[model samples]
Target: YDLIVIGSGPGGYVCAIKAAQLGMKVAVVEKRSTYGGTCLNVGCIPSKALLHASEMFHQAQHGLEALGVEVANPKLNLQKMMAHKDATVKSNVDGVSFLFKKNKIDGFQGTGKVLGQGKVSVTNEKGEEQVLEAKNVVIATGSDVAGIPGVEVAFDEKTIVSSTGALALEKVPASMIVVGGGVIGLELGSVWARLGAKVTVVEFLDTILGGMDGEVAKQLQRMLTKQGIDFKLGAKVTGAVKSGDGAKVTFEPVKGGEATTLDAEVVLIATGRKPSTDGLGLAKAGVVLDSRGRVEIDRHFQTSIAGVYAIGDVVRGPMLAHKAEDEGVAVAEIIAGQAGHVNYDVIPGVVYTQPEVASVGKTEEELKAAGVAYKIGKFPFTANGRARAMLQTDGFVKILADKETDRVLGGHIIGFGAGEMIHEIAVLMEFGGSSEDLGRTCHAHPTMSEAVKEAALSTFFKPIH
Candidate 1:
């Protein structure tokens, strides 16, 4: 028989492709006219395009002299930058659409609702309804942006914006106020800061990028501050009011301080995202949801109802595209009668800031809280030849290992390309490899990955700068 996947996001599309590769007739239902979901459409791809372009702009403005490059004063063509972002998004989403056709997986453009076990109803843009029956149905509807806490945000897209609207700002605002210090806020804020906006981040937590390693977050905060991104940590936004051509952000300290109001040309709400289960009719289909509004699923990614399954941000675990992609593959393989699995412990989290942050496995604080005796070894990128050559030496790599066994427990990196470089350690940890094993791996000379190997050496034996 065939399988039906709701939502053609990273998880859904990848799952459908893998299942089709395994000879299962597959169909994917998506509401958006495009194939890829938020990540390709408005999230990762667009943000990354801006991040890269703005980084280059920042470098030309401030870092060119140091790098021995002579240049006139840099000017930002905001419209061109937005066009670049749009093009990047189009290429990625179009790639997904092409893949669906290549794999012979049927694509349905409509809203997908779970009718019942092994049943789904799709309503297209013209309100044409089609009911599809399959041996199994997989839910891959991802999350949506969450608004400000305790305050209603009337998103006007111009004065008050979300990450989506922030990306398409016609001109760089003279000043920008970002509500959250999380990944999305900092990222978009950095984009504008690099483009000459005086960006201020108002975060409820004392440190930015909460849930990450405290030391990493603190160091990143310092770096961003040095780059002219101001931080007002531990501040709670009580209200936001639009004034003439700008918005006033009023806040009090989370620890109870006098309220203060600040105005900015643009205010971005980057609180976070919530699971998108609003119109899926899960309750009508007898599907169970967790307290956080995520679908409940068993170890095999199957829901309470037989012949129904869920994956990705709508299901559980970290709301990461890659994590969801792995789960999608696992579910597909399981449906194909193979023993598929995901190593939750080895899943990596990456934040694509200037000097990207990436982590896999447990953190030092996590190990300490768990009462595990571990040793930490770290090496700064300042000592790496490659980092020095690129003049991007602002962060470090820290590795935590079991004290007795020297088995690598965790790895964290805050440097350029950390997102991609962290995976070597993830692979090592996945094989239960020790710090010594990682240290001995042949790393090519003068590469950022060498920093990872050197850090591993420090964990096992000693680090060589």
Candidate 2:
């Protein structure tokens, strides 16, 4: 084969399909029977379904009344809700399989191990093994959940769970303690919180969404609090132990304080993820990994060994699905002898909780730390006419630009549909556009996106509104 990718994830399957499209014989080996790895099977796709369904449920219970639409108690059938999430996952994974068939890519269902240059061995459940030949090999095994440092927590996937188990819970846990306050933790916690669970989030950092814009994080925390989710910020987890039918989380202040233990119906460890490279035999294959156990790759996405490459969560950078998809395309094009590139600086990160938070480029803290003198322009949702009309006014839009040149450096939004609205700023920054350029672009009146334009307008000169 011209190309062989191990792991049919967003990074792997996409790379395989693109390679096949470029007139190369491509094949993919996935451990799971279905295509589209973690993201489609158990991560992004399933979580979004739950988030949406729960949001609708919450709206029916609380939001619609304000608009004169009465919902009679808004009963929730959890089994049906789980069924919807499962159906959503099935459709997405099946779509990947269809794409593979259309592109004429061979699919192998087994555990794939790299066996040195141009060789990958696939072992089936029956202990049968087959070696596949390729001109180039791409390892996109993605990542696995990371446990707390120095903590011995066992995941029963019932009482003690990870993000995966949290999604497939048999019923809404009466109480839940999420171990991390990052995107995954917040998102999954929000799903349960909106569905009538008492949710508590504990984080090592003082702020939620640690790397996001500080003000956005603070405001989001406030909003989540208003929704009845409790927070324990600046707390470090020392243990997660199962207690009878429930679980207990023990933590202390990161700044040194008395340790506290909280018990809940479920405990979710969402500390983050680690590169899934343990059983791949990278050492025997002569591939090198970095200090953080990520596959070491150069600028062109090639590993230390020639004719071998890696991308996505297995490598350095944010472990985001879209990031992996872009890398997949770039790697395939590079192999096809084309100029493939990914502008890392312009990639957007989103938190899919209510009144979604989305951000691209540098944060204010990052700019100040780097000593890159910058100015900020902010527009609150309270001031946006559309927000008032929809009764979804909870957050704001903030744009950062170079103090001297007025070039837009970063854009952050914390409001409804922020994920979709962040892209316009991203597109503008892609062209090296200034605040004035984005400000001058006419936005539809009374639309949520106008807040973005208003923020930009304030950055360059002054906003009309």
Candidate 3:
């Protein structure tokens, strides 16, 4: 009897590896032949591959001509680019497989179910089933893509698509309509748009990046607009149906207005994702599930039944991979009788558009709603020496700090490498470091990171040039 983990997603595989390290006999169950789950297989890893390549292509076509380097207009070699993406995915997934074998963990390629207390059943495609005894079970089933509520979006991965379908397109569409202005939609939409598609985003909320700091979201929206993407905010998508060889999208304003129909070569539905916990036999096994179909667990990450646990998108908290990875380590330590804690407050969230959007900790709106007095400090990339040298000045960094103590409450960025730059603020907030502390810390000259330090300095006294 040992630990049996269901789903080989980031959370599940990570927990399995940690459990094995803790000296428990461990086994991971996954339906697919690959082990890294959606993140390594399709989600973040593949999307970044496309984003990076497309960025270089865009730079060559639009930005680099101003520099001393003379180059011709960029051309698209779809087959070669897709091959590189496939190769990247293969290497990463293969690396995870290597980790499992190295860690001495067993892998079962089949559908796993909780039979009862300490029992798990795995069924393969051949209609064969096997029952195994397990001292503990972890559910890290992650989440599934959500479609537009009250609307049916028939995604054929061709004319109409989800994020998954967006990646596998045969050729870039000449025009695309992206439903829902959330990260997934904007991210994949940006990918095709960089490749020469006329992209339009239809969002339900007044703001594009809902839940992000409003001003930072506006900065990104402005940058994307300058990059030739259109926005339809405060719009509710009603239906997306196949129209001729392409697809058409219909939407109306959330505040009651006439319906508008838009045609495109492709339509992407990125409404959001829902926790995927179906077919796990949790009901029969006595594990409690929440109203949203997520597995119910206590503060210690234990399910209703004894010795059973859950994490990642299947449990609670932000559905970020790093969050799940942290929980995986925490739960494994708990199983090993060690104290493991995850600081959910400091988890970083990022969107990989042209100029990335990344943030950690609280937002200005959140602090205001919570009645917390905060100070704001902002520095635009336009004023940075490196930004001017690179000709990529597009966004700014905004730092929020405590009004009384000057402690950093949050950091938001909408610039190149914002995803990486925002981490300095995350580490500061992790240690509860004050704005003065960050301001005093010496930064290298003429770098993008100096903008972060300048923002921090602006939070306290004044910034030094």
Model 3 lDDT tens row, 1-465: 489988888999899899988898998988887988879897888988998888888888888767877787668998888888899999989988999999999998889998876888999989789997888888888888898889987889888888898998999899999998988888998989999999999999999887888888888888899889999999988889998798888999999889999999999988878898877988888899888778899988999999889999898788888898999999988988899899988999999997889999999999999999988888889999998888868888888999999999999988888999888989999999998898888888788888889888998877765
Which rank order by TM-score, best down to worst?
2, 3, 1
Model 1: residues with Cα > 4 Å off, grouped in runs:
none
Best by TM-score: 2
**In model 3, what are the clashing residue pairs, if there are any?**
none
Ranking by lDDT: 2, 1, 3
TM-score of 1: 0.97
lDDT values, one for every candidate: 0.90, 0.93, 0.88
Per-residue error (Å), model 3, residue 459? 1.0
What are the candidates' C-alpha RMSDs? 1.3, 0.8, 1.1
Q: How do the predictions measure up, each by TM-score?
A: 0.97, 0.99, 0.98
Candidate 3 TM-score, true structure as reference: 0.98
Number of the top-ranking candidate, with lDDT as the measure: 2
